[PDB]
Amino acid sequence: ATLRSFVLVDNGGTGNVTVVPVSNANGVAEWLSNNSRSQAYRVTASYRASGADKRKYTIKLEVPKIVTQVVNGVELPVSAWKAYASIDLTIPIFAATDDVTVISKSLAGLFKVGNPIAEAISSQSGFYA
Amino acid sequence: ATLRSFVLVDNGGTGNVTVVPVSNANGVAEWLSNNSRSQAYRVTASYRASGADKRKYTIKLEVPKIVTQVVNGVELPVSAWKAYASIDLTIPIFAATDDVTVISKSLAGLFKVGNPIAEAISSQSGFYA
Amino acid sequence: ATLRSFVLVDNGGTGNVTVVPVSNANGVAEWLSNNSRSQAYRVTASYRASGADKRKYTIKLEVPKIVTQVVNGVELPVSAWKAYASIDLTIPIFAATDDVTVISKSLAGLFKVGNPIAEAISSQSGFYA
Amino acid sequence: ATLRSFVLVDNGGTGNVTVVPVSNANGVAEWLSNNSRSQAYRVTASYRASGADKRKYTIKLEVPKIVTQVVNGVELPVSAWKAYASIDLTIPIFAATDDVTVISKSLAGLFKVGNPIAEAISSQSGFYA
Amino acid sequence: ATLRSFVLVDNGGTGNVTVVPVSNANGVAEWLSNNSRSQAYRVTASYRASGADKRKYTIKLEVPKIVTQVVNGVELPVSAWKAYASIDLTIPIFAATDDVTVISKSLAGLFKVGNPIAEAISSQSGFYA
Amino acid sequence: ATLRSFVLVDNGGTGNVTVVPVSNANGVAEWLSNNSRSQAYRVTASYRASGADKRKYTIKLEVPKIVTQVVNGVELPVSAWKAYASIDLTIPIFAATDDVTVISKSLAGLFKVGNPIAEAISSQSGFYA
User: Fold this and answer.
1) Which chains contact C through at least 3 pairs of Cβ atoms less than 8 Å apart?
2) Domain-by-domain residue ranges, chain C?
3) What's the rounded Cα separation, in Å, for the pair E70 and E65?
4) Which of A63, B42, D83, F12 is deepest in the core (most CB within 10 A)?
5) Which CATH superfamily is domain C1-129 in?
6) Do chains A and D touch (3 or more CB pairs under 8 A)?
7) What are the respective helix, strand and coil percentages of chain F, to the nearest 5?
8) Taking CB atoms and an 8 Å limit, are A48 and E23 in contact across chains?
9) In chain B, which residues have their Cβ closer than 8 Å to the Cβ of A65?
């Protein structure tokens, strides 16, 4: 089943952040961590067709700011306490399985921990040699 | 050391697609697979300030269908089509290192091979499966 | 597992009115009693975001007066009339699980058989009695 | 008597939340828990006639956010610290007692703890199988 | 649990064509087989109200002729042509369960293998004698 | 030998609804059950060319709600209402035998009892999950 809970944050067993399915409206999977929606880790995704020659995946992720956070509190402005991400993946209809798994892996590679993009993000850095 | 080559696609140890830094103009880092520009996997990233209190990473991925076209015995290296991924990451400036890191990980988790998103993509599926 | 049948009307163990899931289009869950649409108890619910910091459950209930009309010996199943209940629930996103739960209970308490509201309704009365 | 205090939140004896009558203007029963009006659990209801063929019950409920709350404090914005609910029940004049008690029970069933609507609310979930 | 994968083509056990649910937006369920979208079996359906007392199913089937096109030495999975089927079912709201079931079975019988319509279809024939 | 009687509704062995060929004028085959024409199941079909390379089956089904009307003490076998189904199949002329057979089976599978479409129909449902 594609709609199942999964570990969104692998902290090596200890502080793992799992996210669960919560809704399914209009074919928009929604996973929520165990927190108030304002402080939750959140993921949404959908696979619609787009144009007459490609399908498109649309995924969104919300990551909370943690340090200093008052769990379950009402800390405003939300805009200051959360990071947002949007991913649009466009895959033309001619792609066959093996093509798709690569695309799949590429994404995984791009954001893998220890790789430049990942490193950069976490070091508040930009890109440079 | 963020601008450095890395493996985009990890097929164990054989067909690994490594991608290298090729330019960094106007704050746009651009990596490239080892192919003619007409058929290379390509990645670009940029880190800029957004608003007076946010920052934004913008990453784009290009996955080609590598093939050799032949027009009158004149074989040209081209791509049947390409898949595109586009990511916008917005992070508040209040985000401390620890905070940033989680974002970092969350992303990696989200797209990890084996998790739902990865699954779905790799089977051209929706989340109803 | 929220989209599942449940007993709408509990008359001990005899005339229990159970209602089952029948559709879920456009994020509107719709349960139905076991009757022709022309005479079924019906319930619908939807959960959407409202504003940039609230969520809203919208629930509607239809209680029919089940009867068999006869026009020229042509007996059709219809409803003499229907009673309608409509509920709007607005909850802040700051609401943590524990918070949500109370809401949950509060509602159930409010309408419980034996409490004032239940009484009044069940005797077509006001609160002056 | 319909205007009496009742347990709005059944926490199994221990932390039960009782709500008491507080006002009765224009046939609008008002029950308040024991708190500052800003943090109180609150219930209002009235039975007016509507149209020339149905009576209507109008009930409203306010549920406070509790976790993190500073009892009796002044925590703004109230909009962030409270959940609201509105119920409109319309019952045509031809309904006789037994009809009404069903309607009555239906409501109770709809919101009963352990049932989908209830479950959904409290799990911050939507509806799906 | 109606939006689920099922076998569209039953060839005993070998070439069975299974079709899965992929999306359900705007009340349109879409099922696809596991092929490059450019050449996959497709089924869509919707159940909506029509008029004041009817419901209307609208089902559409798409059967592809799977092949691999090649142009200037570039091969692409394409569909040589497709067969299209369109079905409209209209049902009164008075239709109670048993009734619906019958309707349900009629369709089945209609298209059942071995019965005239199927035979005709599968032999490029019309209905003769 | 396609214009022949067949079983429209298979109820094991009891209430089987058999439908027979009654006429075949102007390329329209008509099958009726054994009831007063005012209230009989009906099926019609035609196979004609369409365009320069397509064939088109046009099948229509009629399911009656059998009852006996009575007016001024005069009873007549009438139909309380009917469910209508309309089907259009379009097939390229390149479709060779095997192809056609598949198309043939798809339809069967589509409407097969136990598969989603049938289930939905027979339960006043839509396609959900």
Assistant:
1) A, D, E, F
2) 1-129
3) 16
4) A63
5) MS2 Viral Coat Protein (3.30.380.10)
6) yes
7) 20, 50, 30
8) yes
9) 92, 94-96, 99
